[PDB]
C-alpha cells in the first residue's frame, strides 16, 4: 500500500522538539515524488542520497522524526551544528544519510495571545549524542548547593516554552520539521519506491 507519510506530515498535532516523536515506516510503497513535488516546503535538504532516485531504491526501514522549532533554529537540524537545539534537543550524526524537511506552521501552531505548549530544553549537564532524546524534568543545578524540591540558588527547571504568536518575526515563528533516516540491513527491504525491481 502507500506509505502513511500523510499521517506524519499532515499530523494534526506535533511534538515538542525536546520530546521529538519518531515513526518507523515499514512494509509499503513510498512515493517520494509526492513530497518533493509539494513545493510548499521551505527547507528540503538531502544528504548522501539522490533527489529522485530514492523513488527507485528499497530500504529495510524508514524513520521519520518530527517536531516543532523556531525558524532561525532550522539551520541547526544538519550534521555537525551546535546550538541550543542540536546540543540539548535533537542531534544529527556527522555521517547522516537522509533528508531534512521543514515548513512554516505559523497559521497552525501560533495563536493570538501566545502558544506555550511547544517546549524545548534550555539546560543540560552535557551534549546529546546522535539520535538521542531526553525528556527528564530533573531540576537543573547551576549553583553549588543541591536542590531537591523545586528551586533554590540557581536551580532552574530545564525546559522552557517557545512563545508562538502570529505576529512574531519570521525567524521567531514556528516551523514543523520531519527528518527521514534510511536504514538498509541484511534483512528484507520492506519500504520500496514504485520504480524498483520488485514490482
Amino acid at each position, epitope marked *: 500500500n502507500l506509505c502513511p507519510f500523510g499521517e506524519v506530515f499532515n499530523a494534526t498535532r506535533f511534538a515538542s522538539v525536546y520530546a521529538w516523536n519518531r515513526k518507523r515506516i515499514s512494509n509499503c510503497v513510498a512515493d517520494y515524488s509526492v513530497l518533493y513535488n509539494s513545493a510548499s516546503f521551505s527547507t528540503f535538504k538531502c544528504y548522501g542520497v539522490s533527489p529522485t532516485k530514492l523513488n527507485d531504491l528499497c530500504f529495510t526501514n524508514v524513520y521519520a522524526d518530527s517536531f516543532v522549532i523556531r525558524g532561525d533554529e532550522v539551520r541547526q537540524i544538519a550534521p555537525g551544528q551546535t546550538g541550543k537545539i542540536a546540543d540539548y534537543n535533537y542531534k544529527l*550524526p556527522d555521517d547522516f544519510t537522509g533528508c531534512v524537511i521543514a515548513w512554516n506552521s505559523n497559521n497552525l501552531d501560533s495563536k493570538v495571545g501566545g502558544n506555550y505548549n511547544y517546549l524545548y530544553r534550555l539546560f543540560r549537564k552535557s551534549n546529546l549524542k546522535p539520535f538521542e532524546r531526553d525528556i527528564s524534568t530533573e531540576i537543573y543545578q547551576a549553583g553549588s548547593t543541591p536542590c531537591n524540591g523545586v528551586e533554590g540558588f540557581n536551580c532552574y527547571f530545564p525546559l522552557q516554552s517557545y512563545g508562538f504568536q502570529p505576529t512574531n518575526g519570521v525567524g521567531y515563528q514556528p516551523y514543523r520539521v520531519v527528518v527521514l533516516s534510511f536504514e538498509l540491513l541484511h534483512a528484507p527491504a520492506t519500504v520500496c519506491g514504485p520504480g524498483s525491481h520488485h514490482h
Partner: antibody
Amino acid sequence: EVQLVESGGGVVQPGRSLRLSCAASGFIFSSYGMYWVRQAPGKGLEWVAVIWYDGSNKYYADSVKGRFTISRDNSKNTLYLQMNSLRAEDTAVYYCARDLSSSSGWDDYYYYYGMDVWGQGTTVTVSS
Amino acid sequence: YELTQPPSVSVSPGQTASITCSGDKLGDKYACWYQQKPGQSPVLVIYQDSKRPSGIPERFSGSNSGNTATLTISGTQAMDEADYYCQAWDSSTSYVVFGGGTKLTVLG
C-alpha cells in the same frame, strides 16, 4: 526480584540445531530491549544478538548471521535463541541480558544503554 | 569496528587503577563497563560514559573523550580483582561491540 533464567543448553552434535530460552520475571519484560551474549571457555564476551522491546527490529553479529534467530514472546515473558547449523566454535556459555532503558510504548523510539541485568548462563558444548 | 583494551593491569590495594578502551570516534558513542569475577555473570559498573548504576560503589568512575574511554577505581580493594570489559553500542546499525577485556589483579 528482577530475574533472568537461561535454559536449554547441553551437549549437541555439530551441524545440528538447538533452541535456548530465557525466562524473565520481576519487571515489565515487554518494555525492554533484550540481548544474547556468549563467552567461550577462557575467552571474552562476544555479542550474539539483540532484539527490540516488541520484537520489531533484530540485529545479529556477523559470526552468527543467517544461522541464528532471536525472538521473544512478550505474553509469556520469554526470549528465545534458535541456533542452527551449529559449528564447534559456538561452544560457549550463553547469557541473556536486559537493556536498562525501557520504552513507554508511544512512538517507536529506542536508545540502547548498558545491559544491567544478566542471567546466570546456559552452557552449549558442540562436539562430535 | 573494534574496541581495544589493555590485556592486564595490576595494582596494590588502595591504589588507583585505570583501564582504557580505544575505538574510532568512541567519544561519539556511550561506553559501558562490566565487571566479571570467575564463574560469575557480568555486572554493570558504568554506563553512559560516567554514570554508575544503582548499588555500585562510588569508587568506580568513568570517562570518555576523543577516542578513549577510561574506567577508574580509586582505593582499589581485594574484592575488585576481576576481568573488566568495555562495551559500545553504535548509534548506527545498532551493533554492539565489546572490548577484549582486562585482567585486573589486586596484589593481595
